[PDB]
Every structure is written in C-alpha cells, then in structure tokens.
From a paper:
F1 domain of ATP synthase is a rotary ATPase complex in which rotation of central γ-subunit proceeds in 120° steps against a surrounding α3β3 fueled by ATP hydrolysis. Upon dissociation from the Fo domain, the F1 domain can catalyze the reverse reaction, i.e. hydrolysis of ATP driven by rotation of the central γ subunit inside the cylinder comprising α3β3. The catalytic sites are located at interface between the α and β subunit in each catalytic dimer.
Two 120° structures were classified according to structural differences in αTβT. The difference in αTβT between 120° and step-waiting is the result of movement of the CT domain of the αT subunit. Thus, sequential structural changes occur; a structural change from 101° to the 120° associated with the 19° rotation of the γ subunit, followed by closing of αTβT which occurs between 120° and step-waiting. Notably, the 19° step of the γ-subunit from the 101° to the 120° occurs independently of the catalytic cycle of ATP, such as Pi release and ATP hydrolysis in the F1 domain. The αDβD dimer in the 101° and 120° structures can be described as half open (αDβDHO). For instance, a comparison of the γ subunit in the 101° and 120° structures shows a slight structural difference.
Author numbering:
A (entry chain F): 232 to 471
B (entry chain A): 24 to 501
C (entry chain G): 230 to 284
D (entry chain E): 1 to 470
E (entry chain B): 128 to 377
F (entry chain D): 232 to 352
Write the structure that this text describes.
C-alpha cells in the first residue's frame, strides 16, 4: 500500500490520504516469524530487530517537497499495556496521538479519548491561537485536578471538600461529558443522526462552560451532543 | 586402568568435570590431587560432574582424581561433644583431632509413619513467654521467624543454656554466619557451661556454597546417632534462608531452570527432606527424639514471602518476633498473637496449664485497647483494670539476657500475676518485685518448690496465697 | 452544651467511618499491587528460561 | 532379552540402554537389584518408571526412591507392565507406600494376590451414567445446603482445629453403614506425624476396618509423590468396577501432586510454563480427575483438600483444580468456638447439585428460604450493635427468633463424636431433614426453647428434648 | 481438509438475517444475526453452557444445523448435555464433537478445526449452520503445551507468538456468503473463561479483537438471583441491529 | 585495597581503617562479569555467586591478635528499595548501620542521619 501511495506522492505531486487499519499486526507477524529464523528472543518475546524493522517502514511515510502525505494509523495495544514494546516504540514516529481508554469507553462517553494522554505537536499559541491555547490548557488543568481529587472523594466524601474543590468537580464532570459527541457512523447503533462541530464552536462552548455560564444545567444534558445550543435544547426537553 | 582414577577436564566456580571413574557410585566422595574432597553428583555417559567441597583454586585441568568407595557420610559419636567442627567433620578449633570410630550417611530416610509416637514431653526453653504462650514438646519442630536483629540467636542460646540439668544434647548449626559471631557464641556457651553437652557445626560466609548447603544435613546426621540410641537431642539451624540461597547458587551454576521467585523447583523438597527427619520415636525403637528449631529471616516483617510460607507449611508452628516490639524495649519481642504451637500444649505441665489461660486472655486483650491509648479514662473496667493488668503482664514477660529461670518459679510468678497479687504494685517496680520474689522463694518456699518439681501440679492455693502475702508484707515499694 | 457534645459525637463518627473507608481502599489497592507483581515475576522467569534455551 | 544396563545417573533421573527391538513401553516398571560384590559397593533395591524414548535404544526413567549407590553398568530388568498394586479385600485395613508394599507390621501380601496397573485410560463415554444422582451422606447441613453428587469432586477448606478429620471419619462411617461402600484415603506430600495421628484416630474410632491408606509423605521423592494419588485411585477403582459399590476417595492435598509433577518436569528438562508449572499441568490434572466418575454399575466420589498458594485463587494450579470441582464445603472457626458441629458454614458452602432439576422443587425452596433467613440475620447483627436489641422491629424479632433455631438445628451428633461428648450419633435422611426445616420455617416450633435445638438428630428428638427440659 | 482458506472479501454479504436464541436478555438488546460470530465470556459457574444449550434447542423450527464442540470438558458434563439435547429433540439436527480433559493435547488443539470443517460442508451448499466452541481458552492452553514441548520460545504469559493466528484462522471461516456463492452462512459462538472477571487479560483481549461483539456474564449478578446474568455495560453487538426484526427494533 | 591494608596489621600489628567508596558498584561489577561469562542470572539479574563474593570480600576484615581492621562502607539504595539484593546481603555483615535521609538533608540538618533507623550492637 505504501508503494502505491508513493507513486502519487512523487511522480504526480498529489496530496494523498493514507489509512492503515492496524499497523501493530505488522510487528506481530514479524515476531511470529522471528523465532523460526534463528534469532534469540528479546524482551517479552519480541524480535531483536523490532525498532529497525518498524523504522524502515515508518520513515518512508513522509511528506517531501514534491508531494504531501497525511497518514492516519490505528495502533492496537495488546492487553491494555501501554508499556508494551510495540506501542512504546511507535510513539516517537508520530506528530499527533490520541489514546483511547477502556475506562472512558465503559462509562459510555464516546469517542473515549483520554484528554490528558493525547498530545499534538500543533498545540502552540502561534499555530492555533491564543484563546484556543488558553482554553485547552485550562480544560486540561481542571481535568487533572479532578483526577487528583479521586482518592479524597472516595474516602472522605464529597461533603468535606473545600469551596473551590467542589466547584472544580462541578465544572470537571460537565467538561468530561461535553467532550463526548454523536458520530455520523454511529447512527447504526443509535437513532441519533450525529453532527459536525467547527473549531470556533468548540472553543466558544468550552470557554462558556469554563466561565461558569451553564452551571445550572444537569450533568446528563451534556452527553452525546454537538454544539453548545444542543445542551440547552436537551435540558429544556428535560424540563430544566 | 581408569576404573579407580580420573583426570579433570573442566574447572569453574566450584564445579569440576572429570573423565574416567568408571566404577564411581552416585553420591560418592572423591579425592583430588591436593587433598580437597568432592562429591560425584552427576554420572553422565562419558564424564562425571564433581562438586568441590573446598578451595578450588588449587585444582587445574589434568590433575588426577582418586576414588574413595564411600557414599558421603559424617563422623559421629560422643567424642564430638564440646567441639566446633565443619560440615565434613574436620575440627576447626584446634585441640587436635576428634577421635571417633563410627559414621552415618548425610542422606538417610526419615522415620516411617509407623515408627513415630505422639509428642508428650515438655521442652523447657527457660523463657517465660515461650513456656507460657507457645509450649514446645520434645520431638516437635518449631519455626522461629523474624527480621534482622530481633533476638532469634539470643533465644536459641538461652534455650541451649537452659538444658544443663535436663537429659538433652544440643547441636548448634551456624550457616552463613561471620566467624567472629560464631566465635562469640562459642565463648558465651563455654562461659555458661553449655559446651559440656553441645556440638557446634560452622559454615562461614567465606566457605564454598556446597558446604553451606550441606551443613544442616550434617547436623541432623550427628543428632540422629544419639536419637536412635534412645537419647533426646535439640538441633538448631541458624539460617535456612541462607542455606536456600546457597542451594539456589549451586543449582544456577549447574544450569537448572529457575522456578517461582527465581528459587529452584525443589526448594520445598530441600527443607522437607531436612525437617522430616526430626521425630519422636515410639517405644519399640527406644524413646528417643530429635527436636528442631529452624530460623527464617524476613524482609520488613513480611510473612507472605516464599521461603517463610514453605517453612510454615512444613513445621508444626511458628514463633514470630517483631521489630517494633524489640525497639520499644520489649526485648523477648515475642508476638503471642501471631505465634502458635500446634503439637505443643499437650506436653505443657499441669501447673503451667492451669494458669496460662488467664495470662493468654490478658495479653490478647491488652493489644486492641492499645489503639485507644490517646485517651486515658473511658471506663474503670475497660481502661483502668484491663490496661493496668496488661501492662503488668508485659512487664513480667520481659526477660534479661542469658538468664533462664526454672519452670516452677515461672509458674509461681505467673500465678501471682494472674490471681491479682500484683494489683496494688506500680508498673515500674514489677521487675524488682519479681527478682526479690525469686530470692524470697529460695529463702523460704522450698516446700512449694519441691512440691511443684515432684508433682507437676499447683500446690495448695491457700498456702500459696499466704506465702505471697508474707512476701508482700516485707517487700518495699520505692 | 448539648450542641457542643453533639458536635463531638458527629466528628467522632465521621472520623471513624472515614478510617473504615480508607482501610477498605488500602486493602483493595495493596491486594491489586500484589496481584500485579506476580506477572513481572513470571515475565522475568520466562526471559531467563528463553535466554538459556536459545543458546 | 528383557535386560538392560544403566548408562546415566543424574539425581532422580536414570537413563537405561536396552537391546534394539526390546525397549519397554512408556510408563513401564523396571527393577534394579544388586548385591555388593566388594566393600566399595552397597546393596540396591529400586523401581524405575519409564518416561521417554531418547533414541539410540536409550530410555529415560524416573526413580521411585533415592538413587544413591547406582553405578554405570548395573543390570536392569523389565517387568513388562506399569506399576501394579494389590487390590481387593486384602487392602482393607492396611497401609501402603505407592509401590503396593505394606508399611504396618501385619506382614506381607502373598504373591498370588491380584494386582492392577497404575496407569489406565479413563472410562469410555458409553460406560458413564446418563443421570445425575445425589449421594445421601446423612449429615443435615451437607444434605440440605451443599448436596454431594455420585461421581463428583468436593473441595474441602478450613483452618486448623475446626473438625475436618472428624468430619471425614463420620463421612466414612455413614457411607459404610448405610450405602454399603468403603473408603480409600490417599495422603499426598503431607506431614508424617499427621499421617500417624490420623491412623491412630481411625483405629480409635473403629473406622480403620473399612478403609485403606496410602501415604507417600513429604520426605518421599517427587516420583513417588506424583504417583501416590494414582495408586490410591487404582485400589479404589476395583470395588466400583468389580463389585459395583459406592466408594469415597480422600486426597490429603491435591496441590502437592501438581508440585511434584512440576518438580519431575524440571528434571525431565521441559520448558517451564506460565508461573514455573509444567507445560502438561492441565493434561495431568485431567488424567487424574477424569477417572473419578460414576459408571453404569458404580461410582467414585472424592473429597479433596486444596492448598492455595498466597491465597491467590487465580494461580494456575488452583485455577486448573477448581474447574473439576462440583461442590465446596467451608469450615468456620467462629462456629467451632460457638459450639456448632460439624461447624460447616451455611453460606460459604456452594454446590452445583442444588438446583430444582436435580434435587426437587420442595428441597430447593426450603434451602433457599433458609439461606435468605440466615442472610437477613447476618445483616441484622450489625444493627443490633448500631442501635440495640429492643429497637428492632417485630418482624425483625421474628426473623431473629427463627434464625437462632435454624442455626442451632443445623448441628448434629456424630457417631465418632461419642468419644468426646458421650452421646450416640444420628443418621438423618434427606427427606426427614427437609420436612424438619420446613416445619421450623412455618413456625410450628416457635414456642420451644432455642437450646433444645442445639445438638440433635431428627426434629422429633427436638421436641423430646424440649419435653425433658420443661 | 482441516486447514482451508477463508472466504474472500468479495465472497461475503452484510449480515441481515436474525438468529433467534429464544432468550429475552439476548434477543432484545444484544441481537445476533446469521453469519455473525459473537463471543460469550464470563467466569466459571455462570451459565455459559446453558446459554448455548438454550440457543441450540430454540432452533428446532428454523432450518439450521447445529454443531456443539466441547474442548476440555468433563465427560459427565458432556453426557448430561447430550441427554438434555436428546430429551428436547435437538439431536435431529445436531452434531456433537468431543475432546475431554483426559485426551492428549493435540486432540484438544484440533477439535475446533474439525468442527468448522464439518460446518463448511453445509455452509457451501447454501444452508445455515451454527457452531459452538465450548472453550477456546483450553484450546489455547493445549496449544501452549504443544509449543513448549516443541521448544518454541514463549511470549507474553508463556503463550507462543501465533496464539493470535490460531484463533483468527479458526474464527475467520465464519461468514455470510453472497448470492453468487450460494447464500449459505456459518455462525460461531466461541467461549472464553475469565479469572475474576478480568476482561483485560491476554486471551480475552485476543478473542475480543476477532469477533463481532461479546456477551459478558457476571458472577456477581449470577449469584443473588439475576440468573441470566446479562451485564449490559460490557455486552454489545457490532453487527447486530441490522439483523433484528422490525417490531423488536422498533 | 584490602590487600594493601592487611599488611599493616599482619607484619606491623597496627590498627587500620579501610574506607570503601560504594559496595553497590562492587556488586554491579560482579553482576556484569557474571553476565559476560554467561551464567544464569539470580533473583533480579544479579550473579548467583553474590553471597559468596560478598563473604570473601568482608570476611578478611577481621580483628586478630596482631592487629585489627575496621571498615566504614557506603551503600547506595536504588529508589529507596531496601529489599534490593545488594543491600540485603550487605546487611548480614555489619555491626552498626547508619541511614541518611534526603528528608533531613532538605531541612538543612547535616549529616542527615536518621536517629531512629540507625542501630548498633
Ligand atoms: N532479652 C534481651 N535483653 C537484652 N538485649 C537483648 C535481648 N535479646 C537480644 N538482645 C540484644 O539485641 C541484639 C540482637 O542480637 P541477636 O543476635 O539476638 O539477633 P538476631 O535476630 O540473631 O540478628 P542478626 O540477624 O543480626 O544475627 C543483640 O545486641 C543482643 O545482645
Ligand atoms: N462433632 C464434634 N463433636 C465434638 N467435638 C468435636 C466435633 N468436631 C470437632 N470437635 C472437636 O474439635 C477438635 C478438632 O478435631 P479435628 O482433628 O477433626 O480438627 P481439624 O480441623 O481437622 O484439625 P487439624 O488441622 O489439626 O487436623 C476435636 O479434637 C474435638 O475436640
Ligand atoms: N437460566 C437459568 N436458570 C436457572 N439455573 C440456571 C440458569 N442458567 C444456568 N443455571 C444454573 O447454573 C449452573 C451452572 O450453569 P452452567 O453449567 O451453564 O455454567 P458454566 O459457565 O458453563 O459452567 P462451567 O465452568 O462448569 O462450564 C447450573 O446449576 C445451572 O442449573
Ligand atoms: Mg544472629
Ligand atoms: Mg486434620
Ligand atoms: Mg460449561
């Protein structure tokens, strides 16, 4: 597939979308066949040449002067172990990553992206904008504080938290729910048609939530909606 | 001929490979050229694998190995009494050779199921806490377990010293200890007179790993000679953990696959073989017995470790010592909560049995209430009485170093503590009260002492009450 | 006086049940740690065995 | 030819070379007998079990005893069959050592006695029974809340000094009395003093005349510890296959069997499995457990004690063993110290048999109602300390009043408990105990004193005790 | 043959025909279509075998052949299952393949392939087949034993490298053929036994990574009266819903 | 260094002090040598001969009739893990131990010796 894409990159100078369904199976097959070739086994049973074999493939998928390639890869994580050598080695080859989580998938908030493990090289003030950068950093800070409060909440109870901690929890749960979205392709599982949300709408909605505008709405109003106005619509259906 | 000789072909890390020795037996002793002993462990098709039992730097490729015709054994006899000796029976204290005329193999089957008898004789350790809370019977094997510097060696030395007038032979096996430590232990034993009936087997940390692996088996082999003649023997293995480490090293050098927690597969079989040879023989075999006191060292008090779990599964009980109790001034440091003896209690004498229950209850009670220590006076019944009696129990159960006391005096003082003669005595004066009570007993109560010593039963309660009241009449609180 | 004593009782029971909850969580977490570590132990044993075998 | 010679000795593993075309089959038995020709030799008497065919007419074996004194070149004799132990009536009241040789001093067994091979394929699919049946033990707790199954495997758990040994003796006594069967006890890798104590206790109780014992304890080699269970099972199988009886089989600790198998595998040199266990763990467990089944003419049911390493029920050995179990009985030191015997926990015990299809709608309803009552009492025991006895509601008072009598009526007097208590035992049929528990549930006996239910057989004896008391 | 290539990309059709299991807690919220492969996962003593037996019995009216493959099961349990099938009349259309725990490891390794090869015969004639694998975890254990006996270096949790390839090769043969290939189908219901409900273990994740969904049975629910023990939090059908009758979907 | 120190008490009968920079690095070097020679690793990758090597080092530091050697040794504990095999097998040979705390160092209390973790016979 990469050889087919490289011709369009080079001989025609054309933009290419490259989709790879599961790049981990490549290294899995390499590890399956490595034992029969006479190589000594490396850590957790992988081949000694795990890094070089994957690098020789990954470094061919790049954008050059004559043409551009943007590639989206799904990377399976065996047994939910993010420290496994195959997922660990492929991290350095990427510009933007999103880490899906079984914990978020189980609570029902899709796409279940981890809002703190995900990182991108393009999140800089001079690339996305000052307001966008500040809103994103504030959201991450609130989510991290909510994550830290999870032991004291479980043990001592919600009542004994200070005035500011309760407000942090209140904003954080609504932010975590509003991060969910209804997808066009998910209409096969549910009757909800799905939506497409522009970046301006996302930034303005998260800014409004952070400023405490919508603290009077219930938590469940924020699940699986698009723009911020749909939250008000759902709350009014609920009766607010 | 190559039937009774062989030449070495490989030497490394105390393991040697020899060509020849066509008639060597499995488990035999072999002689190297420079006087170093060895075991023929593996008999392969074309070569023999030998485990060296000494300094292997003097062995090169090509030097001859001579056969001896004897499966590995150790010398035995009464001539070993009062001497310190290496696992192979070579003296290390000087004083000339040990002249003996009998041997017994290191490997020997344990007494059969039909050769044994129920344990019924007490073994007086001379420690109040052990003799009261966790009694030990002759022929039992009891684990002593704790952390670094908690008093296990001191307990063993005190038990060995206390056996002077008893008809018992003691054997002290030191594995992995420092030579100066073994020397100091031997000096204390000589000073207190225990060398009249004690054998010391030493294998210091500088010795090759197989000697450390073999030392406890040599100790048991020495003990079995007396045991099968009808005598009573007490055997102490100072570090089964270090023996296990030496065995792991040997197994890894032989390139055997590892097991759980990196220890070898038959690590349980090692200690099962070792500790199954201690038993109480029936009357048909002569009423001999061998009792064992294995030691295991924990890491930060963790009992769930692999070796502690194996030894607890093997033995008939455990004595657990606590670092916090040791640091807080409780020097015997015995935790009567976790400690338990399963075969003992049957061997405990009637006088101690009639009185131990109340002390057990008091000491158990004065552990949970120590949590409610931040506040003083909740109730007179809950705080005052319980805490006072528990504190006095903790004071009486304390003991000094290398001073065992007789069972009858222990019984009398425990009776005095339980019945309430210490109710109106301050805590700080309890040890002086106990000491002056022992002196007063020696002064006047020889009738009660002899009655206990002959009948193994409590004397007349009213007479005991009046004797203790007469002592309290003279004892001064200050 | 009644209200002060009520405050004492309330704080006492709150601290008691907080301690109970904390010890429950500690039981769960420590036992989780202990189930986890056996996997590392078996992994290192597997690595040693494979290294010995491959030669 | 049928003669070979030793060529390698490496601990318990011995390699033997035979003439081409005369190799013994796998699992066959080989005998080494030697007389010391001179002073540099020792007398040898040893049994070997074939394990592999290494090629070049060489066979690798596992010794059943110590291999000290072996010399490269000693003659080996082939027996032409696996280990064979005596079976039949002669094995009752005797103690064996895994080779079938007696340990007690009653003398040897004549050479004309029938002997059966240790190794044998499991019974065919045709020969199994088509319907599930309940083994009536005669003990109220087991027969009500945790029924046993003919051909099923039962796991026994409990702390020290709770009553496991006396319960085992009572099970043997009741089975021998009512169902006409016998029992076989197979210790595996346990304490020799515990085995001797068990022998003496059985002799005192009089159970010994109806049981056979094989011990092979901790000090034995792994080869012997790995086959003690099989020899006990093969002496048990004779009575079910040839006389059509219902037989009990007690395995002292099934975990030691797996541990011995792992030790043997490490000597054979196989690659270690997940947590150091042998790669053949599941296969060995299956080959042992699948022979304990109910057939068209008889059954074998096994009571097994299982040690769990580090209390981790997800460890491979307990995980493999638990897949075969059909029931579980748990003992309680709390009940033991309270004075309830046989101290079986009525809520921790579980059983696959307790279903309306197998046991019956009436039995199932009574049992479930009893469990619900006990659970409600367990819940109320917290509120008693929270608030106080009088503060509870009237319906909760009635629940407590029923629960005390239920919990006391679960107790029973054992035949083998006479030596302690001074009272004769009772064999209570399952129909009678179901009727009695229904009657207690319905409130027919709420007026009786709760202590008259304390330790008693049928329900009529309870009213007799109440009549004698008041 | 035991080993045969799976149907190609262009040989398949989207699943659109319901498989009525006769159980509400399945047919209502976790529907199963023909040609789908749905995982049944849970702990021991949870009703995994009972679900499969009920599904097989319910197929009497429908024109479907059933294959029950038992790997590592107790022979008494297999005998009782066969007796229930005989009593309810499902042996008019059922094949039972057995390999008990007493059998050597190769037969345990080999049984599911024999079952699916028996199923393919009816599948390629334009018929509909249902195949039940009673344990894939025990097949994995048998294959691990075989690999370690053959001295192949182990990977994670001592399993060999191709423990994924084994199951993928087995389960990829279940398919919904198109009208050009005849319209036949094969349905698979593999079983996985978890330990203390650890859905994140190596073998459960490997099998989840293959099938079209999973039905999670919880022991906490099975005890205390929720007898079907369905856990709607972890149960889902990725292909179902498009193969559900309009009334139930409505 | 031990060979250089032993002379002063053997031939001259002096009292000598032997300061060893770090035992941890000695054990690490031993483990590296073992892995280079190809031996099977011990518990956490250390050499099987760790205990014997430590004994053959420490056992020569003893007092005799002619003289005495006393040794002050520094031990490094990785990640505060006192369960580590090198400190664990070092503990068995010490008469007095001293525990230093970065907690005390940060407050400014030098030498930062913990007054409760330090023991001496
Ligand atoms: N009852 C006691 N009274 C006073 N001091 C005691 C008592 N018991 C032990 N000690 C002292 O406590 C220290 C513990 O040393 P001991 O050899 O008994 O411990 P150990 O557990 O064998 O430790 P190690 O692992 O260092 O060999 C010694 O200094 C010893 O003198
Ligand atoms: N039914 C009973 N009637 C009277 N006493 C009983 C009964 N069951 C148990 N006991 C008492 O409990 C004691 C424990 O007996 P047993 O040897 O069966 O216990 P155990 O739990 O198997 O112990 P261990 O772990 O030591 O083998 C008996 O000696 C007896 O005193
Ligand atoms: N719907 C149901 N109603 C009542 N009982 C049920 C139901 N489903 C299962 N059971 C009961 O659950 C028990 C075990 O069920 P089943 O044999 O199907 O479990 P399993 O998960 O296959 O077990 P195993 O691990 O033994 O293979 C049996 O007693 C059975 O009667
Ligand atoms: Mg000591
Ligand atoms: Mg018992
Ligand atoms: Mg099942």
């Amino acid at each position: 597939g990469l050889t087919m894409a490289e011709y369009f990159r080079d001989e025609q100078g054309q933009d290419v979308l490259l989709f790879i369904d599961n790049i981990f199976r490549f290294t899995q097959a390499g590890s399956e066949v490595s034992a029969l070739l006479g190589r000594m086994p490396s850590a957790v049973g992988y081949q000694p040449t795990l890094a070089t074999e994957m690098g020789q493939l990954q470094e061919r998928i790049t954008s050059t002067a004559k043409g551009s390639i943007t590639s989206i890869q799904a990377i399976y994580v065996p047994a939910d172990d993010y420290t496994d050598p195959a997922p660990a080695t492929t991290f350095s080859h990427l510009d933007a990553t999103t880490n899906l989580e079984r914990k978020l998938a189980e609570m029902g908030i899709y796409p279940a992206v981890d809002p703190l493990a995900s990182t991108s090289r393009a999140l800089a003030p001079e690339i996305v904008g000052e307001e966008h950068y500040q809103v994103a950093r504030k959201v991450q800070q609130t989510l991290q504080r909510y994550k830290e409060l999870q032991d004291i909440i479980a043990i001592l109870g919600m009542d004994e938290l200070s005035d500011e901690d309760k407000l942090v929890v209140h904003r954080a749960r609504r932010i975590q729910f509003f991060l969910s979205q209804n997808f066009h392709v998910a209409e096969q599982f549910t009757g909800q048609p799905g939506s497409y949300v522009p970046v301006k709408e996302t930034v303005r909605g998260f800014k409004e939530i952070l400023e405490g505008k919508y603290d009077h709405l219930p938590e469940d109003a924020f699940r699986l909606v698009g723009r911020i106005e749909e939250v008000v619509e759902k709350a009014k259906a609920m009766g607010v | 001929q190559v039937s009774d000789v062989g030449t070495v072909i490989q030497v490394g890390d105390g393991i040697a490979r020899a060509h020849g020795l066509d008639n060597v037996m499995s488990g035999e002793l072999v002689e190297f050229a420079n006087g170093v002993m060895g075991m023929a462990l593996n008999l392969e098709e074309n070569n023999v694998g030998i485990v060296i039992l000494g300094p292997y730097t003097g062995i090169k490729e090509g030097d001859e190995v001579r056969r001896t015709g004897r499966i590995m054994e150790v010398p035995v006899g009464e001539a070993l009494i009062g001497r310190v000796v290496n696992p192979l029976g070579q003296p290390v204290d000087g004083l000339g050779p040990v002249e003996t005329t009998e041997t017994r193999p290191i490997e020997s089957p344990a007494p059969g199921v039909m050769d044994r008898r129920s344990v019924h004789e007490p073994l007086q350790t001379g420690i109040k806490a052990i003799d009261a809370l966790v009694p030990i019977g002759r022929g039992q094997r009891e684990l002593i377990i704790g952390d670094r510097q908690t008093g296990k060696t001191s307990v063993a030395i005190d038990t060995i010293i206390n056996q002077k007038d008893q008809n018992m032979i003691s054997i002290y096996v030191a594995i992995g200890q420092k030579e100066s430590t073994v020397r100091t232990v031997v000096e204390t034993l000589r000073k207190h007179g225990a060398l009249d009936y004690t054998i010391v087997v030493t294998a210091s940390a500088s010795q090759p790993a197989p000697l450390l692996f073999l030392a406890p088996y040599a100790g048991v082999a020495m003990g079995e000679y007396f045991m099968y003649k009808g005598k009573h023997v007490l055997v102490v293995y100072d570090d089964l953990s270090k023996q296990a480490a030496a065995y792991r090293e040997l197994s890894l050098l032989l390139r055997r696959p590892p097991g759980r927690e990196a220890y070898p597969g038959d690590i349980f079989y090692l200690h099962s073989r070792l500790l199954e040879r201690a038993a109480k023989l029936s009357d048909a075999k002569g009423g001999g017995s061998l009792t064992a006191l294995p030691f295991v060292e924990t890491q930060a008090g963790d009992i769930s470790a692999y070796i502690p779990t194996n030894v607890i599964s093997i033995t008939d009980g455990q004595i657990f010592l606590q670092s916090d109790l040791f640091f807080s001034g409780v020097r015997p440091a015995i935790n009567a909560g976790l400690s338990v003896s399963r075969v003992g209690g049957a061997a405990q004498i009637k006088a101690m049995k009639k009185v131990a229950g109340t002390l057990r209850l008091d000491l158990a009670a004065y552990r949970e209430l120590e949590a409610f220590a931040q506040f003083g006076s909740d109730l007179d019944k809950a705080t005052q009485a319980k805490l006072a009696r528990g504190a006095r129990t903790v004071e009486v159960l304390k003991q000094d170093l290398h001073q065992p006391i007789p069972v009858e005096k222990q019984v009398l003082i425990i009776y005095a503590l339980t019945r309430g003669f210490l109710d109106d005595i301050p805590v700080e004066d309890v040890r002086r009260f106990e000491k002056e009570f022992y002196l007063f007993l020696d002064q006047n109560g020889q009738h009660l002492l002899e009655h206990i010593r002959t009948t193994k039963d409590l004397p007349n309660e009213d007479d005991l009450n009046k004797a203790i009241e007469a002592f309290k009449k003279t004892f001064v609180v200050s | 006086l009644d209200a002060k004593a009520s405050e004492h009782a309330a704080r006492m029971t709150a601290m008691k049940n907080a301690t109970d909850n904390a010890n429950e969580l500690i039981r769960t977490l420590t036992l989780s740690y202990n189930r986890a570590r056996q996997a590392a132990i078996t992994q290192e044993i597997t690595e040693i065995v494979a290294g010995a075998n491959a030669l | 030819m049928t003669r070979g010679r030793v060529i390698q000795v490496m601990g318990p593993v011995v390699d033997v070379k035979f003439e081409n075309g005369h190799l013994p089959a796998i699992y066959n038995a080989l005998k080494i007998q030697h007389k010391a020709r001179n002073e540099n030799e020792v007398d040898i008497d040893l049994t070997l079990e074939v394990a592999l065919h290494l090629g070049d007419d060489t066979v690798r074996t596992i010794a059943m005893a110590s291999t000290d004194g072996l010399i490269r070149g000693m003659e080996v004799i082939d027996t032409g069959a696996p280990i064979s132990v005596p079976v039949g009536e002669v094995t009752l009241g005797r103690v064996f050592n895994v080779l079938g040789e007696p340990i007690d001093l009653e003398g040897d067994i004549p050479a004309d006695a029938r002997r059966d091979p240790i190794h044998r394929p499991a019974p065919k699919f045709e020969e199994l029974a088509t319907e599930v049946e309940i083994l009536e033990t005669g003990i109220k707790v087991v027969d009500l809340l945790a029924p046993y199954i003919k051909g099923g495997k039962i796991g026994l758990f409990g702390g020290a000094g709770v009553g496991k040994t006396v319960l085992i003796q009572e099970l043997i006594h009741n089975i021998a009395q009512e169902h006409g069967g016998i029992s076989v006890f197979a210790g595996v890798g346990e304490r020799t003093r515990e085995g001797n104590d068990l022998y003496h206790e059985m002799k005192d109780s009089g159970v010994i005349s109806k049981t056979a014992m094989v011990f092979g304890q901790m000090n034995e080699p792994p080869g012997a510890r790995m086959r003690v269970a099989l020899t006990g099972l093969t002496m048990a199988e004779y009575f079910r296959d040839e006389q059509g009886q219902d037989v009990l089989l007690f395995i002292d600790n099934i975990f030691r069997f797996t541990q011995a198998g792992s030790e043997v595998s490490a000597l054979l040199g196989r690659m270690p499995s997940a947590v150091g266990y042998q790669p053949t763990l599941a296969t060995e467990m299956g080959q042992l457990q699948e022979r304990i089944t109910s057939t068209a003419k008889g059954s074998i049911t096994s009571i097994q004690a299982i040690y769990v390493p580090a209390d981790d029920y997800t460890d491979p050995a307990p995980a493999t063993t638990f897949s075969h179990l059909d029931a579980t009985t748990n003992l309680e030191r709390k009940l033991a110290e309270m004075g309830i015997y046989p101290a079986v926990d009525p809520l921790a015990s579980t059983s696959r048999a307790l279903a309306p299809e197998i046991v019956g709608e009436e039995h199932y309803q009574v049992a479930r109602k009893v469990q619900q009552t006990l659970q409600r009492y367990k819940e109320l025991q917290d509120i008693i300390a929270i608030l106080g006895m009088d503060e509870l509601s009237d319906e909760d008072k009635l629940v407590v009043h029923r629960a005390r009598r239920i919990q006391f009526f679960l107790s029973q007097n054992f035949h083998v408990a006479e030596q302690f208590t001074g009272q004769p035992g009772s064999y209570v049929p399952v129909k009678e105990t179901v009727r009695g528990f229904k009657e207690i549930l319905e409130g027919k006996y709420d007026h009786l004193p709760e202590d008259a239910f304390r330790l008693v057989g049928r329900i009529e004896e309870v009213v007799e005790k109440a009549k004698a008391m008041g």
